[PDB]
């Protein structure tokens, strides 16, 4: 229509610019109420999940010890995860602090405020992992039919685990058992290696203060070896964490527990 094209295009440019500006302003107004130190709510995350290493697909661990290529992915995943727990990686004394080798009460490093600076982090020693650290056995129990898994509790800001009342009041217990009565006899003898010889998570690594107040944070680990798995069968194992603060769900199969199915072939 000639000259009115400029007028209608100008109207639409102004209208869409105003719409974008109003949307951006509403987003800023909403984000002004959002803290960068602690989340507003923890409705979905507060009861932590229990997760294992290596990261696997369909929850199945299946390998043949005689073929190194069957467990290469598992070993690579374990190496990639544990590479940050090396002794050389925790040498900075201004960032890392040497908490006790025995379980203790949670360490309160202040409040969720930008003051007080970055919070120091307890060190976790790979030697505590035991037969599953890679220091001596580079295959983490694989290559021998005795696989290792590393259990971790999902990180939640300001969350302090509460071990159940009576034994150790500073360790959150974890146990791995066969899922069914068929798996309970073929699973074998479960070996646990935790810090100080206790099966669980020491409480001094809690609470977690976030990726901005506590970078380089190391969550506690608990390695589990099996060492007596029945060959050529699929054993279903259930690892569960116990605590007053720890809850479970029938819809979320990874909340406070997880399932792993391990088959070591011949």
């Amino acid at each position: 229509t000639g000259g009115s094209w400029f007028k209608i295009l100008l109207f639409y440019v102004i209208f869409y610019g105003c719409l974008a500006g109003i949307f951006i302003g509403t987003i800023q107004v909403m984000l002004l109420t959002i803290s960068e130190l602690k989340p507003t709510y923890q409705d979905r995350v507060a009861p932590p999940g229990l997760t294992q290493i290596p990261q696997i697909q369909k929850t199945e661990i299946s390998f043949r010890p005689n073929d190194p290529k069957s467990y290469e992915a598992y070993v690579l995943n374990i190496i990639r995860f544990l590479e940050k727990y090396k002794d050389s990686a925790q040498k900075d004394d201004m960032i890392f602090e040497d908490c006790g080798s025995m379980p203790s009460e949670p360490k309160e490093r202040g409040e969720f405020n930008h003051e007080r600076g970055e919070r120091k982090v307890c060190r976790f020693k790979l030697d505590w992992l035991g037969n599953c650290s890679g220091l001596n056995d580079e295959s983490y129990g694989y290559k021998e039919g005795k696989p290792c898994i590393i259990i971790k509790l999902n990180r939640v800001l300001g969350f302090k685990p509460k071990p159940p009342k009576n034994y150790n009041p500073n360790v959150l217990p974890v146990q791995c058992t066969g899922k069914r009565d068929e798996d309970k006899d073929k699973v074998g003898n479960i070996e646990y290696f935790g810090m100080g010889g206790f099966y669980g998570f020491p409480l001094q690594y809690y609470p977690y203060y976030g990726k901005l107040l506590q970078p380089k944070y190391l969550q506690p680990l608990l390695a589990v070896q099996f060492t007596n798995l029945t060959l050529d069968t699929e054993i279903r194992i259930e690892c569960k964490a116990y605590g007053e603060n720890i809850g479970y769900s029938e819809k979320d199969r990874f909340q406070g527990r997880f399932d792993v199915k391990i088959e070591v072939k011949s």
Partner: protein, 982 residues
Amino acid sequence: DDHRLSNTELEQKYGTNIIQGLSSVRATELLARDGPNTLTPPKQTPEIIKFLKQMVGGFSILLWIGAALCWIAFVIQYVNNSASLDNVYLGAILVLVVILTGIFAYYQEAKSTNIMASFSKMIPQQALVIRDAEKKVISAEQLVVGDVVEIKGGDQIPADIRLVFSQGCKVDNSSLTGESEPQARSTEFTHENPLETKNIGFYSTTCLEGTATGIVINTGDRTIIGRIASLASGVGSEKTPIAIEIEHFVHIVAGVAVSIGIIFFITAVCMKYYVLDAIIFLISIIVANVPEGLLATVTVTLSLTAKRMAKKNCLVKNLEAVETLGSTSIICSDKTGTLTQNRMTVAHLWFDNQIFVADTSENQTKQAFDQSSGTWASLSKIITLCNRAEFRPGQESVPIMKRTVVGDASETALLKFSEVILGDVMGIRKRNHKVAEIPFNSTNKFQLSIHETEDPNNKRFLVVMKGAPERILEKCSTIMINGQEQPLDKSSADSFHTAYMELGGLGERVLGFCHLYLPAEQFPQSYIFDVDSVNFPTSNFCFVGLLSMIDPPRSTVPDAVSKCRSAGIKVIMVTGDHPITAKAIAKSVGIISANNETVEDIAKRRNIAVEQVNKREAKAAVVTGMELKDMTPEQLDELLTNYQEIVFARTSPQQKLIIVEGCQRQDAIVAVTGDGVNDSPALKKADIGIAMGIAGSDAAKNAADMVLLDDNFASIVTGVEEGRLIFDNLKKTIAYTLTKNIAELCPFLIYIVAGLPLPIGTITILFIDLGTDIIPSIALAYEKAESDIMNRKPRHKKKDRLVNTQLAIYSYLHIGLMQALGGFLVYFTVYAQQGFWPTSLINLRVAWETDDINDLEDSYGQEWTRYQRKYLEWTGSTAFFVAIMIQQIADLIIRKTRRNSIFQQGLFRNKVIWVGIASQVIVALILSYGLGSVPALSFTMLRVQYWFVAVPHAILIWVYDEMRKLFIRLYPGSWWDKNMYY
């Protein structure tokens, strides 16, 4: 044709003998050669085919494609084990939606009828035929062309016959012309047109009196009534204007959806996506772009309007007919029975050298013309005493102008006039004993009666007579003026002349009345009279007055015609009656304005030939059927274009259909009003056909979309206004339902191109479609008019679409984008308050949906399992749904007016709007906390703030629409008004 041949030439053409008739062998041979004398019923499509054709109409084809894509996605998700079971639910819901929409569409479509089933009580069952020189009563279905038949009074003519012998035969051709006046029949070629010939009897017509003999010339569907029925059944299979508008809207929406799907599939496959992600996105596009409940809502609104109008005695047989009245620009109206009362009544009186006007209302109980008591007592005595018509038994409390009468139409009019004025007619007749009576015959053209006065003071003989005005005058020698006698002269024989022509130029039949008092000396009390016109005198009477009769207009018809014309509608009279009566009735009902003149009125007022007057000075036209017969379609187009007032007179049903088609050829929506068999082809061909209830025939009522159950012409104006309101409210409903489509579609586009976790699911938006705004969509149909709706002009059928570019643009690119932004604000609020800042959500979708990742890290370093991410996704979906609901509340508020403000129109005046708002809130609450308590169908319980996050965006939508309409009102016809008004 057969009416021009002689008896002998008819006996050679048809191989028949009038005396002997056809043989019994040739009768069967001709029954085999030509077939039975019956009307073949039309071929109707099966009901199940009609029902099944509605499963591929509207948006159903796109929904079928969506269901197919759902099945192909589920087979892929089953080959690679995925415990979803969500595409089957969506496909089943889409199929159910298709079925329900098809059911509604089937209920909306026009019902099928066989008008030939109404040509049933007119068809004779048996026929008296002459075969083998012996008369026998055979069935009329065995008649063959060339058969000699006999017809009597009160008989239906068994076929189209050429009368060879006739004796006092009169027939009723109301099935051909719409006129119930008896027609004299003879054996002589009288007029060139076969339909006006006096020597052809027509199939399925009534022989009123006399006897006749005829040869069958046409049989079965080859008859006049058979051709009328075939023409009625053939035409009238087109789509209503509202169906065309809905089809155009469906085309627009389907084209938009198809283009978007093609573009965003072609780009998605090139964005490193695989088949499942490319087809689930296509399903989402189809579901979001299609309004899944709008067509059923349209059907519901049409049903509601039809139910409302049925309470005003207006039966709507087709649902879509409630809108056609309202876009109609031309009304073609039958005269007799439709515009008039179909009852002859006394119209004018001429006595005392004065012309009086009589009341012609259907419900009248008095006459207000000047009853001077001089010459009026004599006129009333002649009217009451010189009538043979009497009321029928069982009618005493019935209104006088509604009672049934045995007798002539002219005598019935006089009897009802005398009963209205005098109250007692039978008693007065009984008091004045009738001692002689010469009945009315067409040869005499008068009726004589000798009575005895009810005056004991005098007790003389009073001989009264009525008849044709000229015969009465030439049988009269003295006149009565002001109650006193007076000799005739040129002063009173010319006043009579002028009065006779004045009354006869109004389309009225005039009757002359006179009396004579017999002397008591030469006619004593006994004096037995001889009816042989010997004993009593039959000349030198005393003229009293003239009375004229007409079939008058209905009381509510002139005002209805005036209001329809004021609404911009052209009213055309199409009648089978004679032009002189038709023109007068057109002037009476306002079809022809008082100032306007025809091409002959100017010639008479200028004393010149009709070729001297320019055809552009005349504003009215009266065209006869014979004038129309020699008219080329371009000539008819020019005649319809050049004249605003046209009267078509003496037309056949074929000519009525021709006129309707010529009116339709001018890009016009045409309404036809009729009440007879001869109107059925035009009632069928018209965009909307309206029939009369009490006065209408069954054939007319079967061919009509609408029936006026009380014969009230004012229902036409109410229907026009209702249709005009429907067309204005349907725009609001369509815009309201189209606004939410973009708000449902934008989340999927952002989900695909930006990798955000799915803002809303495909099942979730179906609840907005079919559960949340169904009642608001219905509520927008109860809106009132913003301006004077009857003061506009009819919309242009080719230029004023129901859905134009402005409506679609304002629904898609203006309010839908605002709603999408308002929903995305709540989406980001829900996600950020749990730990996922808006920047961290970009390209997070692949890792978000991985079932094997149970430690996904948020903006704070916390680790999330897959199920908690699923629950947060469902929470965001529910928040998006609630935001769409909240913004659709404001959309409902702003879509209830197109130009006016909420302050001017009123916020609480339409309570169905608040019912719809409450339904929206209640449905959202049930979904969020009923299906959220147990997480099902991607619904979770929300926090309180997520119901109010998007309120400011709704307020902004309302503010924007209010300002836009304010500046439309402030500057009419400006750049803003042209480009921003939808």
